[PDB]
Amino acid sequence: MTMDIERLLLSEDNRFEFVNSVAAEATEYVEKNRDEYGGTKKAIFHVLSNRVNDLGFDRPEAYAESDPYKPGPGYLKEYYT
Amino acid sequence: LVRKLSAQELQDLVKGERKVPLIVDFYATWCGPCILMAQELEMLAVEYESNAMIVKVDTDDEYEFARDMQVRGLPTLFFISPDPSKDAIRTEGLIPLQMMRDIIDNDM
Amino acid sequence: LIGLYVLTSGTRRGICANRYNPCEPFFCNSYDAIGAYRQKRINLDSPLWLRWQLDQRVIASKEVPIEVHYESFGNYHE
Amino acid sequence: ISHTYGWPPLVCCFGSAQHAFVPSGRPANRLLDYERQERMKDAVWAPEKYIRAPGGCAGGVAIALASLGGKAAFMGKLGDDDFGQAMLYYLNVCQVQTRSVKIDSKRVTACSTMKISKRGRLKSTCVKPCAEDSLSKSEINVDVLKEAKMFYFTTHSLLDKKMMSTTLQAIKISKQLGNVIFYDLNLPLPLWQSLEETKSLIQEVWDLADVIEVTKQELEFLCGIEPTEEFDTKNNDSSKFVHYEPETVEPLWHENLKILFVTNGTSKIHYYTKEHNGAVLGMEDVPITPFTRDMSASGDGIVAGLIRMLTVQPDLMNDKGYLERTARYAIECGVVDQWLLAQTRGYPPNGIRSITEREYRTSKPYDEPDGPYVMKPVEEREYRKL
Amino acid sequence: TRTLQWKCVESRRDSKRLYYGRFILSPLMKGQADTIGIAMRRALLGEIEGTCITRAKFENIPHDYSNIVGIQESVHEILMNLNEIVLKSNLYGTRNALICVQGPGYITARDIILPPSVEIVDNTQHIATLTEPINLCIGLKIERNRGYSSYPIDAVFMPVQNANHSIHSYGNGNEKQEILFIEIWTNGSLTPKEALHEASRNLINLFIPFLHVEEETFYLTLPLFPFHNKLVNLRQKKKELAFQYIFIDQLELPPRIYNCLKKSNIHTLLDLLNNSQEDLIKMEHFHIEDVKKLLDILEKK
Amino acid sequence: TLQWKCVESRRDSKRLYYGRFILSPLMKGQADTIGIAMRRALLGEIEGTCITRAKFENIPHDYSNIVGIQESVHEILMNLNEIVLKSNLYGTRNALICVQGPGYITARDIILPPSVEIVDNTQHIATLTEPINLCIGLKIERNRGYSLKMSNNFEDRSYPIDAVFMPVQNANHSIHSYGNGNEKQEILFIEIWTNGSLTPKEALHEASRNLINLFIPFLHVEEEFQYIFIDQLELPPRIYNCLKKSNIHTLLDLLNNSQEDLIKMEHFHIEDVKKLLDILEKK
């Protein structure tokens, strides 16, 4: 997504209006479908992936991915600092 | 209960008559799969409480009788019918329980 | 920064490389050279020759050859 | 189509695909550290009497060889019943080639109809053989024998007279197509009596074998050597593991025999050629449970190791160094296969009940309120004076 | 007899709870000594289990920082003395033991009433000093575990105090052979030779899982039986068996075709079906003239 | 129960195989030890097959270039160094290249000893312009990665080829830790890259077996006065002055020297040894 953000900013004349437009689009998502956002799907991440897909490229929805090797419920992956 | 018998006890049991099928389990103490077969046979003996009789013969003790019965290895089961005209069935190896249930019903 | 400095401090040269005045392995690709290093066949700063299959993009002093070996059949080594 | 034959060379294992079937079991001595056994007796299972089985069936050798990276095809017959189809499935998943397996709709897997006599002493006299005794000469897959560079078979295929003729036919065809003949004795239970019957039965196949593998107990039986060493005694005295001189096995030699292998489990493997002879020490202190105590997994693992080495360097059948390496490789294959089988099967505690070795080595709490290891009330204390 | 040998070259008993052993293994090929050395060192220091006291229960004690009349030491000092007691056992599970004594005198490790699976290493290890004829009952819990952890006792189960190894050149570069030495220090709960054997066995059990069949290989003690029960279920409610369980070995394919499919790791009927007609031509020795005869066999099936 | 599985497989080309494997569930600290041992076994304990010597027959005049061959002698050696082989050979065997004339010499044109196979048939060796006959004898060996120098046979103008025996190109391991409260559990991942002479799954198996074979041998069994000084002893002047000549002061040092050692020092006689023992028995 870091590279995607830089990709989107190459098509923008002003990065401050880009930030405002993304937030405006994100506010519309939450009003439209309130319950689908705040957990695994974040509205700002959904806006960015939608805008990459609008260019014709392909990204997963809201950049959401999960661990397939989780040993069942209750188990949290622990981070090695 | 699965009972241990000698060759003469089994002769007295085969020559006689019965109303239920007879299962003879040739085994030896040194054979690992024979121990697994013992577990299957006691589950079967519980299912067919009086509907069948399960006996075991130690082939190390009775190598003469094991050979005369054409036992070629272990484990080996003999399913002997109470009908004299019917022929017995010899199974070799660790066979699943459903095969034993099929043998008992369909042809014993 | 120290790790990069030690990593890229190359081979010893001249009187620090040879006790006496002199009056090395060749690797087909960079993965073979790195694999030989993992098997402790060469050291991190031991000199080697690397077969190069790209353009000449090695930053070096702009100098003419030390020696040209010119065979009478037409091949020459610079 | 020899341009389509790959590497390693295909090996055809001929005979029976049984499930956990043991031909025989003889008293044996294994190399063991008896100081460790006394220290770990409460945690390590050992048999009261060590009795070793030579191996299993031809199907298990095919499975073991496929596990070593070999190419094994199984030649035999199975019934079309559910048990026959389960065994065929088991062979395919173990990556044994079963194109040489004949499926018989008329015969039944692992079941024979016997005619038990009720007149004098009990006799059996088989009537309708099982599916894995009914392979006919018309059913031999000559294409498999054409590709295969080694033909493996065991004595169990000589017990039935109809099955014996098919084995002889398959052997003769394989010799014609230039296959090496590996004869694994694995003497079945009835043959251990009447040595004269055994010699007459195996004489024809014995002379057609290029490689023969026998156990030390089988070699003693065929040579008329009565066992004189001790059994089940806590030492590793060299009399328990004696390398017989070449002249002791010369009466069993024949013109075309290349190697004779003599096995004492994974403890020791002896080899004999026309020019060379020797032995390699091994290791037989593997985890063993009551479900694996006959060590038949080791025997299949050992033979699979020998086959794997002999087939990839078939020109080194007389090099003494390669023979020592081959024997050591077989020992390692037998040790690993035995070790794995203990983990898969476990311990006693289709109703089959097993526990892991971790559960087997777990003791009781000893927290009984009447017992001497807990805190009783002040009444019954008996404070031991210092 | 064996070409590669090992032996204890020195075995020393510094005290009741300090054992030393040195071992040699030679001759080894170059690099094998380094592989054995680091794996053995990691197993010795991190994989060998021990057994010790995990907690203590006191009868008439407010907290572990009080004092008892008649005992020179404090309650906290008792727990530290219990923590240093070395035990040996081969079995697992939480055991319990007991101290039930009457003073005055010297309480040592030999005064512990141990369950039959557990043994004391050093009798003389000091627990407490009693200066009065009083009654002292302490319950104990004992476990066999790895690593380290009524009043809990901070148990450190590891019996190997230290380990070392060295590698030396065997000689002239015939095959640049090497000699390995291993030094082991234990606390007496097991000898250095026993620690060496336990680390080797533990290491084998860590590497052998890769030699089991891969997960989800067999259909889910006796891996043959579950597939048989599936067939019994399929026989009732006549359903037939799925193509993933049917192998190309059971189709009457010509041997040249069979070798091509197996060479391409096409094993089951479903694997063959998912392959198109262009991919099969990409395989060597399998041509267009072979498609129709293979399709007909599958057409007839 | 502890189980392993392959989670990713790929074949980018005939000489580039990738595989990722999982082993779970493991207790704390176990995955690191397994990963370290397996990686070391994968990189140097697995035997590979390589061309180790090349010999140009027909007496090509021992020059740096051959008439009719576009590439120099050294470039042919470098190309031969890159050819991937697999085999089961014991010891060393010879292969041979015998090409009639113009065209491309590739690995397809190598005549191989019995157990030896070629992985990429299209690997390039030499471009032949003129219709000359080229005859190169090759030496093929199977060796471990951590292995050694094959004893030199240096004559007949056979060019050595410094082969790196590494069928496993690269290997890595990582550990994931999971937990639910006090219950910990770790998962081991192992990544393997091979040059096609071996699949990543087959490399995993050989590394495990080679490790086990390294530790089986450990389970093998076999067939069956300080405070008493020389001065306080009434010794003769010759004996005493000789004892100080060897830096011996206390009776512990005297008893720490053998009777053979006592003779080797200057001016000590056999009668002197007896007198010392006679006095020693008296105390």
What kind and span of H or E run contains D256? none
DSSP string, chain E: --SSEEEEEEEEEEETTEEEEEEEEEEE-TTHHHHHHHHHHHHHHHT--EEEEEEEEESS-SSTTSB-TTBSSBHHHHHHHHHT--EE-S-BS-EEEEEEEESSEEEEGGG-B--TT-EES-TT-EEEEE-SS-EEEEEEEEEEESSB--EE---B---EEEEEEEEEE-SSTTS--EEEEEEEEE-SSS-HHHHHHHHHHHHHHHHGGGGSPPTT-S----TTHHHHHHHHHHHTTT----GGG-BGGGS---HHHHHHHHHTT--BHHHHHHS-HHHHHHSTT--THHHHHHHHHHHH-
Q: What is the CA radius of gyration of chain A?
A: 15
The one-character DSSP state at D211 is: E
CA distance E264 to D7: 14
Cβ contacts of F260 within 8 Å, gap of 6 or more: none
Q: Is A56 helix (H, G, I), strand (E, B) or coil?
A: coil
CA distance F166 to C31: 10
Nearest CB partner across the interface for A75, out of F7, F175, F179: F179
Cβ contacts of E193 within 8 Å, gap of 6 or more: E8, E11, E21, E23
Q: Are D23 and B98 in contact (CB under 8 A)?
A: no
Q: Can you list the positions of beta strands (E) in D221-311?
A: 259-263, 268-272, 277-281
Structure tokens at B33: 């799969």
What letter represents residue F26's amino acid?
Answer: L
Q: Give Cα E109 distance to the centre of its chain.
A: 30
Strand order in the sheet with B53-58: B3-5, B53-58, B22-27, B76-80, B88-92, D111-114, D126-128
Quickly count: other Cβ atoms within 10 Å of residue D384's Cβ: 11
Instruction: Please state whether A69 falls in left (phi above 0), alpha (psi between -120 and 50) or beta.
Output: alpha
Q: Are F19 and F200 in contact (CB under 8 A)?
A: yes
Structure tokens at C3: 């790790």
Q: Are D124 and D93 in contact (CB under 8 A)?
A: no
Angle at E253 between CA E252 and CA E254, to 5 degrees: 120
Q: Report the helix count and the strand count for chain D, using DSSP H and E.
A: 11, 14
Contacts from B36-39 at CB under 8 Å and sequence distance 24+? B36/B94, B36/D20, B36/D291, B36/D345, B36/D352, B36/E221, B36/E222, B37/B75, B37/B77, B37/B94, B38/B2, B39/D348, B39/D351, B39/D352, B39/D353
Q: Give Cα D210 distance to the centre of its chain.
A: 19
Query: Min CA distance, D289 vs chain E (Å)?
Result: 13
CA distance E35 to E41: 10
Rounded alpha-carbon distances, angstroms, from residue D319 to E3, F64, F90: 18, 41, 11
Catalytic residue among B31, B38, B44, B89, which?
A: B31
Report the chain F residue with the minimal C-alpha distance to residue C25: F162
DSSP string, chain F: --EEEEEEEEEEETTEEEEEEEEEEE-TTHHHHHHHHHHHHHHHSS-EEEEEEEEE-S--TT-SS-TTBSS-HHHHHHHHHT--EE---SSEEEEEEEE-SSEEEEGGGEE--TT-EES-TT-EEEEE-S---EEEEEEEEEE-TT--PPPP---TTEEE------SEEEEEEEEEEEEETTEEEEEEEEEEEE-SSS-HHHHHHHHHHHHHHHHGGGG------TT-BGGGS---HHHHHHHHTTT--BHHHHHTS-HHHHHHSTT--HHHHHHHHHHHHT-
Resolution of the experimental model, in Å, one decimal: 2.5
DSSP string, D175-203: HHTTPEEEEE----GGGGS-HHHHHHHHH
Q: Are B40 and D122 a contacting pair at CB < 8 A?
A: no
Rounded alpha-carbon distances, angstroms, from residue E128 to D169, E54, E163: 84, 18, 33
Instruction: Please state whether B82 falls in left (phi above 0), alpha (psi between -120 and 50) or beta.
Output: alpha
Phi, psi dihedral angles at E33 (to 5 degrees): -65, -40
The one-character DSSP state at D22 is: B
Rounded alpha-carbon distances, angstroms, from residue A13 to A3, A4, A9, A23, A26: 18, 16, 8, 17, 20
What kind and span of H or E run contains B97? helix B97-107
Could you tell me which of E247, E251, E246 has the C-alpha nearest to residue E295? E251
Q: Give Cα A60 distance to the centre of its chain.
A: 9
Structure tokens at E80: 């530290």
CA distance D76 to E198: 44
Within an 8 Å CB–CB cutoff, is residue B96 touching chain E? yes
Rounded alpha-carbon distances, angstroms, from residue E231 to D78, D85, D87: 16, 9, 12
**Which letter, b or e, does each residue of D37-57 get, where b requires 16 or more Cβ atoms within 10 Å of its Cβ?**
eebeeebbbeeeebbbbbbbb
What kind and span of H or E run contains B76? strand B76-80
**Which letter, b or e, does each residue of B38-55 get, where b requires 16 or more Cβ atoms within 10 Å of its Cβ?**
bbbbeebbeebeeebbbb
Phi, psi dihedral angles at E138 (to 5 degrees): -130, 120
**Greatest C-alpha distance within chain A:** 47
Phi, psi dihedral angles at F20 (to 5 degrees): -120, 135
CA distance D14 to D166: 10
Quickly count: other Cβ atoms within 10 Å of residue B31's Cβ: 28
Q: Which residues of E touch D6 (CB under 8 A)?
A: 259, 263
**Which letter, b or e, does each residue of D60-97 get, where b requires 16 or more Cβ atoms within 10 Å of its Cβ?**
bbbbbbbbbebbbbbbbbbbebbbbbbbbbbbbbbbbb
Quickly count: other Cβ atoms within 10 Å of residue E148's Cβ: 11
Torsion of CA D208, D210, D216, D219, to 10 degrees: 30
**Which letter, b or e, does each residue of E43-75 get, where b requires 16 or more Cβ atoms within 10 Å of its Cβ?**
bbbbbbbbbbbbbbebeebeebeeebebbebeb
Q: Is D323 helix (H, G, I), strand (E, B) or coil?
A: helix
CA distance F127 to F125: 7
Q: Are E49 and E157 in contact (CB under 8 A)?
A: yes
**Which letter, b or e, does each residue of E9-32 get, where b requires 16 or more Cβ atoms within 10 Å of its Cβ?**
eeeeeeeebebbbbbebbbbbbbb
Could you tell me which of D342, D224, D152, F257 has the C-alpha nearest to residue E212? D342
Task: Specify the pairing of strand B53-58 against strand B3-5.
Answer: parallel
Q: Is D52 helix (H, G, I), strand (E, B) or coil?
A: strand
Q: Are D304 and D61 in contact (CB under 8 A)?
A: yes
Q: Are C41 and F43 a contacting pair at CB < 8 A?
A: no
CA distance D6 to E285: 13
Q: Is D277 helix (H, G, I), strand (E, B) or coil?
A: strand
Quickly count: other Cβ atoms within 10 Å of residue D119's Cβ: 7
Q: Give Cα F117 distance to the centre of its chain.
A: 24
Q: Is D361 helix (H, G, I), strand (E, B) or coil?
A: coil
CA distance C66 to D157: 79
Structure tokens at B74: 């272990």
Rounded alpha-carbon distances, angstroms, from residue F176 to A63, A72, F29, F190: 22, 14, 11, 12
CA distance D72 to E89: 46
Quickly count: other Cβ atoms within 10 Å of residue C74's Cβ: 7
Q: Is D48 helix (H, G, I), strand (E, B) or coil?
A: coil
What sign does the dihedral D353-D356-D359-D361 (CA atoms) show?
positive
CA distance D358 to E205: 13
Rounded alpha-carbon distances, angstroms, from residue D202 to D209, E210, F48: 11, 40, 43
B32 is catalytic: no
Q: Are C40 and F145 a contacting pair at CB < 8 A?
A: no
E138: which strand partners? E58, E99
Query: Min CA distance, C28 vs chain F (Å)?
Result: 6
- Residue D8, preceding peptide bond in cis (omega within 30° of 0): yes
In the numeric block, the tokens 């007459």 are attached to D200
B69: which strand partners? none
CA distance F107 to F126: 10
- Residue F25, preceding peptide bond in cis (omega within 30° of 0): yes
**Greatest C-alpha distance within chain F:** 102
CA distance B79 to B54: 9
Torsion of CA D203, D206, D207, D210, to 10 degrees: 180
F92, F164, F211: which to substitute to probe chain E, counting the most E Cβ within 10 Å?
F211
In the numeric block, the tokens 């050629």 are attached to D273
E165: which strand partners? E182
Cβ contacts of E89 within 8 Å, gap of 6 or more: E51, E95, E117, E118, E119, E142, E144
Structure tokens at D123: 């006799």
Could you tell me which of D308, D265, D285 has the C-alpha nearest to residue D72? D308
In the numeric block, the tokens 């391409």 are attached to E264
Angle at F14 between CA F10 and CA F15, to 5 degrees: 90
The one-character DSSP state at A28 is: H
CA distance F255 to F239: 15
Task: Specify the pairing of strand D111-114 against strand B88-92.
Answer: antiparallel
Structure tokens at A62: 């809201």
Report the chain D residue with the minimal C-alpha distance to residue F198: D69
**End-to-end CA separation in angstroms for chain A:** 23
Burial class (CB in 10 A: 0-12, 13-18, 19+), E39: buried
- Residue E223, preceding peptide bond in cis (omega within 30° of 0): no
B3 is catalytic: no
Q: Which residues of C touch F162 (CB under 8 A)?
A: 25-26
In the numeric block, the tokens 């120098």 are attached to F149
Phi, psi dihedral angles at F54 (to 5 degrees): -130, 140
CA distance D166 to D77: 12
Within an 8 Å CB–CB cutoff, is residue E229 touching chain B? yes
Within an 8 Å CB–CB cutoff, is residue E222 touching chain B? yes
Q: Is D239 helix (H, G, I), strand (E, B) or coil?
A: helix
Structure tokens at D275: 């020019």
Q: Can you list the positions of beta strands (E) in chain D?
A: 10-14, 26-27, 51-52, 71-79, 101-104, 111-114, 126-128, 150-154, 180-184, 211-215, 259-263, 268-272, 277-281, 384-385
CA distance E204 to D336: 10
Cβ contacts of F273 within 8 Å, gap of 6 or more: F259, F262, F263
CA distance E24 to E37: 11
Within an 8 Å CB–CB cutoff, is residue C49 touching chain F? no
CA distance F187 to E130: 51
Structure tokens at F238: 């010759």
Task: Specify the pairing of strand E87-88 against strand E119-120.
Answer: antiparallel
Chains F/A: 3 or more C-beta pairs closer than 8 A? yes
Angle at B68 between CA B63 and CA B72, to 5 degrees: 70
Quickly count: other Cβ atoms within 10 Å of residue D142's Cβ: 11
Cβ contacts of D250 within 8 Å, gap of 6 or more: none
Could you tell me which of D305, D368, D302 has the C-alpha nearest to residue D54? D302
Phi, psi dihedral angles at E185 (to 5 degrees): -120, 125
CA distance F171 to F35: 10
- Give F 243-282 residues with CB within 8 A of chain C: none
Q: Are E92 and D366 a contacting pair at CB < 8 A?
A: no
Method: cryo-EM
Structure tokens at B80: 């002997």
Structure tokens at E60: 């008439």
